[PDB]
Design a protein around this ligand. Structure first.
Ligand SMILES: [Ca+2]
Ligand SMILES: [Ca+2]
Ligand SMILES: [Ca+2]
Ligand SMILES: [Ca+2]
Length: 394
């Protein structure tokens, strides 16, 4: 009961945080190169706790001289699932991805090449701090659904970096663009001749990858051919030290989906199954924030898949599934803590939890409030400190 109220509020606070923290794949026109640029952040869960951030900067330019579509600003939203083939002895990764464009509220000739299932081939040669490796992948893409299925093998033996750190490098032409956004699909517009995709990926507190790729049709097959160079890595760090989780935190208990629903109904105050800017603004104010209408619209747009300007119940479930797979940074947890720690002394008092829970539209007996404290209080001091809060929101 008390653990449900912590999880309910924790989810709401984390949700508000993620809506503001730029989690999608942001695409913009690059007129100077007749192509696009993109930026985004990837969260890599560290096996023993914590997150390794990877900040991506990207640019794509057409290989051919034919006309391409230069998009208005929008983003891609990715759902990735990593697994292992039980009958594969080589170092490998199996990948299932669903990628959808959004971010623009309510067709090129190259798009015609993507109406069915298209075979994919991927080849990567890498060198990270002098540790060389090669990867070959094969599978299929079904852009109608934004669906990719690939299997990758390290053809040089043992991969000297974690597989998750190579996912973004290892075919955005398979993204699903909604009907109202077909004019913003640069990737398909450049086909069949293709594009060059370049990135720098900064692993926070560690080294960086530099990648260059040619993506194009070779016959009926969409081929991704990549060179990757990594420098400045720590031999003992999260990447060369292989300290990152592999498997996607995939499975959802019905207790978890139920917690997401309880969180949803904190926002959805009129019980109509969708969250408006008014409702989101109401919750954020009750937590001590003061967003403008433009900010509220922008926050909703980050998860508003259908572009109708509200967060629908399925859109909320989808975002919460995405967010909870990946760990918060310590800066983010400290910020969540400060929603409760209203005076800043490093301790959440009963009066402070009482204030927050009151304002969020809950009538609670002080005994209910005290047993919340009791649940988080690892050292019977009658308060919640940061170390206790960190465990309560993980
Ligand atoms: Ca509503
Ligand atoms: Ca919506
Ligand atoms: Ca305090
Ligand atoms: Ca305590």
């Amino acid at each position: 009961s008390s653990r449900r109220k912590w999880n309910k509020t924790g989810h709401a606070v984390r949700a508000i945080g993620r809506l503001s923290s730029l989690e999608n794949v942001y695409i913009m026109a690059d007129k100077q190169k007749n192509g696009i640029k993109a930026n985004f952040k990837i969260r890599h869960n560290i096996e023993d706790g914590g997150v390794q951030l990877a900040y991506h900067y990207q640019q794509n330019t057409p290989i051919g001289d034919g006309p391409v579509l230069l998009p208005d600003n929008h983003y891609l939203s990715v759902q990735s699932k990593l697994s292992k083939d039980p009958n594969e002895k080589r170092d490998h990764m199996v990948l299932l991805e669903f990628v959808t464009a959004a971010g623009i509220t309510l067709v090129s000739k190259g798009e015609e090449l993507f109406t069915g299932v298209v075979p994919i081939l991927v080849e990567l040669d890498g060198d990270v701090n002098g540790h060389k490796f090669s990867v070959s992948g094969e599978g299929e893409g079904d852009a109608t659904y934004g669906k990719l299925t690939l299997k990758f093998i390290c053809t040089t033996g043992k991969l000297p970096v974690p597989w998750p750190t190579l996912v973004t490098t290892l075919v955005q032409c398979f993204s699903r663009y909604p009907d109202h956004m077909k004019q913003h699909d640069f990737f398909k517009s450049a086909m069949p001749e293709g594009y060059i995709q370049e990135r720098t990926i900064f692993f926070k507190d560690d080294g960086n990858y530099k990648t260059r790729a040619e993506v194009k049709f070779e016959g009926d097959t969409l081929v991704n051919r990549i060179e990757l160079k990594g420098i400045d890595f720590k031999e003992d760090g999260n990447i060369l030290g292989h300290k990152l989780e592999y498997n996607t935190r995939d499975q959802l208990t019905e207790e978890q989906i139920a917690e997401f629903k309880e969180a949803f109904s904190l926002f959805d105050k009129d019980g109509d199954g969708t969250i408006t800017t008014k409702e989101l603004g109401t919750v954020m104010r009750s937590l001590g924030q003061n967003p403008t209408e433009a900010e509220l619209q922008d926050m909703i747009n980050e998860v508003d898949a259908d572009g109708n300007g509200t967060i629908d119940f399925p859109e909320f479930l989808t975002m919460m599934a995405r967010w909870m797979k990946d760990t918060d940074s310590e800066e983010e947890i400290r910020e969540a803590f400060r929603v409760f720690d209203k005076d800043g002394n490093g301790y959440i008092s009963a009066a402070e939890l009482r204030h927050v829970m009151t304002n969020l539209g809950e009538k609670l007996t002080d005994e209910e409030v005290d047993e919340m404290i009791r649940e988080a209080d690892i050292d019977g001091d009658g308060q919640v400190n940061y170390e206790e809060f960190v465990q309560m929101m993980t």
